[PDB]
Amino acid sequence: GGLTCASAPQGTLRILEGPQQSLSGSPLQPIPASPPPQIPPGLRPRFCAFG
Amino acid sequence: LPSARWQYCGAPDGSQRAVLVQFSNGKLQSPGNMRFTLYENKDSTNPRKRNQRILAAETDRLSYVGNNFGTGALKCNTLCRHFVGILNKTSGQMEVYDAELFNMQPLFSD
Protein backbone atom coordinates (compact mmCIF):
# COMPACT_ATOMS: atom_id res chain seq x y z
CA GLY A 1 0.00 0.00 0.00
CA GLY A 2 3.00 2.26 -0.13
CA LEU A 3 4.49 4.40 -2.94
CA THR A 4 6.90 2.65 -5.36
CA CYS A 5 9.18 4.00 -8.14
CA ALA A 6 7.33 3.83 -11.51
CA SER A 7 8.63 3.78 -15.07
CA ALA A 8 11.15 6.38 -16.06
CA PRO A 9 9.72 9.26 -17.99
CA GLN A 10 10.14 8.94 -21.78
CA GLY A 11 10.39 12.69 -22.36
CA THR A 12 10.53 16.16 -20.87
CA LEU A 13 8.60 19.29 -21.79
CA ARG A 14 9.90 22.74 -20.72
CA ILE A 15 7.42 25.61 -21.18
CA LEU A 16 8.37 29.30 -21.30
CA GLU A 17 6.26 32.31 -22.56
CA GLY A 18 7.86 34.30 -25.43
CA PRO A 19 6.77 37.25 -27.68
CA GLN A 20 8.15 37.92 -31.27
CA GLN A 21 10.34 40.44 -33.23
CA SER A 22 8.87 43.31 -35.32
CA LEU A 23 10.10 44.68 -38.66
CA SER A 24 13.47 46.52 -38.71
CA GLY A 25 12.72 50.22 -39.25
CA SER A 26 15.69 51.73 -37.38
CA PRO A 27 14.21 55.27 -36.84
CA LEU A 28 17.44 56.83 -35.51
CA GLN A 29 16.48 60.43 -34.56
CA PRO A 30 13.46 62.89 -34.31
CA ILE A 31 15.34 65.72 -36.11
CA PRO A 32 18.29 63.56 -37.38
CA ALA A 33 22.03 64.05 -38.21
CA SER A 34 24.08 67.11 -37.12
CA PRO A 35 22.20 69.92 -38.99
CA PRO A 36 24.77 72.40 -40.40
CA PRO A 37 25.33 76.02 -39.20
CA GLN A 38 24.47 78.40 -42.08
CA ILE A 39 24.23 81.90 -43.69
CA PRO A 40 21.49 84.42 -42.56
CA PRO A 41 19.82 85.53 -45.86
CA GLY A 42 21.05 88.83 -47.43
CA LEU A 43 22.90 89.98 -44.22
CA ARG A 44 24.30 93.21 -45.86
CA PRO A 45 27.57 94.98 -44.83
CA ARG A 46 27.26 96.57 -41.33
CA PHE A 47 30.34 98.83 -41.80
CA CYS A 48 31.68 101.43 -44.28
CA ALA A 49 35.01 103.22 -44.91
CA PHE A 50 35.55 106.91 -44.10
CA GLY A 51 35.44 109.38 -47.03
CA LEU B 1 6.81 16.16 -36.11
CA PRO B 2 5.16 13.99 -33.52
CA SER B 3 2.58 16.01 -31.40
CA ALA B 4 0.07 15.26 -28.62
CA ARG B 5 -3.34 16.71 -27.79
CA TRP B 6 -2.98 18.42 -24.39
CA GLN B 7 -5.63 17.82 -21.65
CA TYR B 8 -5.39 18.90 -18.00
CA CYS B 9 -7.59 16.25 -16.30
CA GLY B 10 -5.46 17.34 -13.34
CA ALA B 11 -6.74 17.43 -9.78
CA PRO B 12 -10.47 17.52 -8.91
CA ASP B 13 -10.07 20.00 -6.00
CA GLY B 14 -6.35 20.64 -6.65
CA SER B 15 -6.00 18.78 -3.31
CA GLN B 16 -4.76 15.81 -5.40
CA ARG B 17 -1.03 15.93 -6.35
CA ALA B 18 1.34 13.34 -7.87
CA VAL B 19 4.78 12.82 -6.33
CA LEU B 20 8.17 13.34 -8.02
CA VAL B 21 11.38 12.44 -6.31
CA GLN B 22 14.91 13.54 -6.98
CA PHE B 23 17.94 12.21 -5.09
CA SER B 24 20.70 14.72 -4.24
CA ASN B 25 23.45 12.06 -4.59
CA GLY B 26 22.49 10.75 -7.96
CA LYS B 27 20.32 7.86 -9.27
CA LEU B 28 19.27 4.53 -7.75
CA GLN B 29 20.21 1.85 -10.34
CA SER B 30 17.18 -0.30 -9.34
CA PRO B 31 15.16 1.35 -6.48
CA GLY B 32 12.48 -1.37 -6.72
CA ASN B 33 13.55 -2.11 -3.14
CA MET B 34 12.57 1.27 -1.80
CA ARG B 35 9.59 1.99 0.22
CA PHE B 36 8.24 5.48 0.09
CA THR B 37 6.00 6.96 2.75
CA LEU B 38 4.32 10.30 2.35
CA TYR B 39 3.57 12.23 5.52
CA GLU B 40 1.27 15.23 5.79
CA ASN B 41 0.81 17.83 8.49
CA LYS B 42 -2.12 17.12 10.83
CA ASP B 43 -2.98 20.83 10.94
CA SER B 44 -5.52 21.33 8.14
CA THR B 45 -6.76 24.68 9.54
CA ASN B 46 -3.46 26.59 9.00
CA PRO B 47 -3.10 27.38 5.31
CA ARG B 48 0.64 27.60 5.81
CA LYS B 49 0.94 24.18 7.42
CA ARG B 50 -1.78 22.35 5.47
CA ASN B 51 0.54 21.97 2.43
CA GLN B 52 3.54 20.79 4.45
CA ARG B 53 4.54 17.30 3.48
CA ILE B 54 7.44 14.88 4.20
CA LEU B 55 8.51 12.13 1.94
CA ALA B 56 10.58 9.35 3.42
CA ALA B 57 12.30 6.60 1.59
CA GLU B 58 13.68 3.59 3.43
CA THR B 59 16.37 1.25 2.26
CA ASP B 60 18.29 -1.50 3.99
CA ARG B 61 21.21 0.79 4.52
CA LEU B 62 20.02 4.31 4.65
CA SER B 63 16.98 6.56 4.80
CA TYR B 64 16.17 9.44 2.59
CA VAL B 65 14.00 12.35 3.48
CA GLY B 66 12.51 15.10 1.44
CA ASN B 67 10.39 17.99 2.54
CA ASN B 68 8.43 20.76 0.73
CA PHE B 69 8.98 23.26 3.55
CA GLY B 70 12.00 24.83 5.26
CA THR B 71 15.61 24.78 4.02
CA GLY B 72 15.10 21.41 2.30
CA ALA B 73 12.27 22.93 0.35
CA LEU B 74 14.05 24.29 -2.68
CA LYS B 75 13.15 27.24 -5.01
CA CYS B 76 12.15 25.07 -8.05
CA ASN B 77 9.03 23.89 -6.23
CA THR B 78 7.63 27.48 -6.59
CA LEU B 79 9.47 29.71 -9.21
CA CYS B 80 8.59 26.86 -11.56
CA ARG B 81 5.73 24.36 -11.52
CA HIS B 82 6.01 20.67 -12.25
CA PHE B 83 3.55 18.49 -14.06
CA VAL B 84 3.30 14.91 -15.11
CA GLY B 85 2.05 14.08 -18.60
CA ILE B 86 0.54 10.69 -19.33
CA LEU B 87 0.60 10.13 -23.08
CA ASN B 88 -1.67 7.60 -24.74
CA LYS B 89 0.35 6.63 -27.84
CA THR B 90 -2.67 5.20 -29.55
CA SER B 91 -4.97 8.23 -29.08
CA GLY B 92 -2.16 10.88 -29.18
CA GLN B 93 -3.79 12.43 -26.09
CA MET B 94 -1.62 13.72 -23.24
CA GLU B 95 -3.25 13.98 -19.82
CA VAL B 96 -1.49 16.50 -17.63
CA TYR B 97 -1.43 16.46 -13.77
CA ASP B 98 -0.01 18.65 -11.06
CA ALA B 99 3.13 17.28 -9.54
CA GLU B 100 5.06 17.87 -6.43
CA LEU B 101 8.82 17.48 -6.52
CA PHE B 102 10.68 16.13 -3.44
CA ASN B 103 14.45 16.40 -3.19
CA MET B 104 15.59 13.37 -1.31
CA GLN B 105 18.44 13.29 1.26
CA PRO B 106 20.10 10.67 3.79
CA LEU B 107 18.96 10.07 7.47
CA PHE B 108 21.20 10.07 10.61
CA SER B 109 20.68 11.41 14.20
CA ASP B 110 23.23 12.00 17.03
- Identify the CA nearest to A1 among candidates B19, B32, B104, B35: B35
Q: Can you tell me the distance from the alpha carbon of A50 to that of B29, in angstroms, rounded to the nearest whole number?
A: 111
The answer to whether the beta carbons of residues B84 and B99 sit under 8 Å apart is yes
Q: Can you tell me the distance from the alpha carbon of B65 to that of B6, in angstroms, rounded to the nearest whole number?
A: 33
CB B38 to CB A13 under 8 A?
no
Question: What own/partner pairs with CB < 8 Å and gap ≥ 24 does B87-94 have?
Answer: B87/A10, B87/B4, B91/B5, B92/B3, B92/B4, B92/B5, B93/B4, B93/B5, B93/B7, B94/B4, B94/B5, B94/B6, B94/B7
Residue of A2, A5, A13 lying closest to B37 (CB–CB) = A2
CA of B34, closest CA in chain A: separation in Å? 7
Q: Can you tell me the distance from the alpha carbon of B25 to that of B62, in angstroms, rounded to the nearest whole number?
A: 13
The answer to whether the beta carbons of residues B93 and B87 sit under 8 Å apart is yes
